[PDB]
Amino acid sequence: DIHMTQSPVSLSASVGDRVTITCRASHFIANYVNWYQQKPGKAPTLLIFESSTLQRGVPSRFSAYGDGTEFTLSINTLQPEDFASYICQQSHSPPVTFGAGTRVDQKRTVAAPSVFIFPPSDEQLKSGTASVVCLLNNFYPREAKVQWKVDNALQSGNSQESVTEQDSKDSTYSLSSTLTLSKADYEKHKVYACEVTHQGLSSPVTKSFNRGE
């Protein structure tokens, strides 16, 4: 199969910026590339086909070009409704294959998150499960590292993340991380910690609680 490699993974830009997104094909595919836009919860929208033909009804600030191996999507100039993900696709031969996407969001100043930790309620444990929740509030950029620690033992594979869409008025993100443990496991240990690493923090921030107190 032909593999499509999109860079960068993530891009921060301002209204009025000229934005350039790149897709690389593992094989020479001449002009057989399409570009799509996708916004959260929606189907993709075709922007470009045959690497540079603008799709009817798509605004002319979108253009694209390629050389058979490297293909470039250009937004000139970026508009508010253009903060979205962009996806390349080769149409050269089956199986059809897509790039992994490039996220374009709105640039703002670096903002560190406010971190909070929540123990599981007393009612949930009665049902046999314990959810521990870590909240990262109002930060930028979106990249954040959350490490769960239980009695100072690093956790892997038992948490789930959720990130808001970029806030409309202040361009920050908020993020939730939820650690799930059986009740029995939750009561064999004492100290529950959430450690947050972020560009805005001079060093990692840790919030924690001891069970029962």
């Binding site: 993709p44 789930q160 939730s176």
Partner: protein, 223 residues
Amino acid sequence: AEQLVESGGGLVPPGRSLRLSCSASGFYFPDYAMAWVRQAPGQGLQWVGFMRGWAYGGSAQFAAFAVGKFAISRDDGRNVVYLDVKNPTFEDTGVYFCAREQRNKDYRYGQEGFGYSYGMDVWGRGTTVVVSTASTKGPSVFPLAPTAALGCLVKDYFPEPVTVSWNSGALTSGVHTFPAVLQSSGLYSLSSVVTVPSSSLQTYICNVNHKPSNTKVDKRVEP
């Protein structure tokens, strides 16, 4: 104008054959080759396969993983394309889009090579498929006990959506209700939070409503 609409299920049992339907309107469907493209939670687009119109032989091709495990057929008089999944597993969870391949300037697909190079110009809204043994149900609401922050954990529900407000709408400043995330059980879970001055600990009540199960819950969040 031109429109596709997928149907065929939220929670579906593993191992039982699954049929999705894509109904077309607003265009002459039998002229068009039709594709199925799926998107697992948090993942990128994955082409499942496509089928040509009758005038190009009506053959179908699939991604390597999908060969022999999925099937596509069309009923042109009913303006519908189908995707059949034999033996679905958790790996088949995601949103399934139906899409048509655009024809070129000359109302044609390409004459040389593959020929489907004018982009997928019409897409359905997508149908969420979750392969699991779980059943439809409303959510359990648990408090997230307390500048300070508190919230509500809205856990184990299907399908989307739920709506969450705070103090019946009177509290909006600092509220963040997070996108639902799918758990390994096949049920959704979500948290709603708000930051608040630690002196005010004012009363705090989250009001979660889940219409598909006729569930309304108001939970008091105290320290």
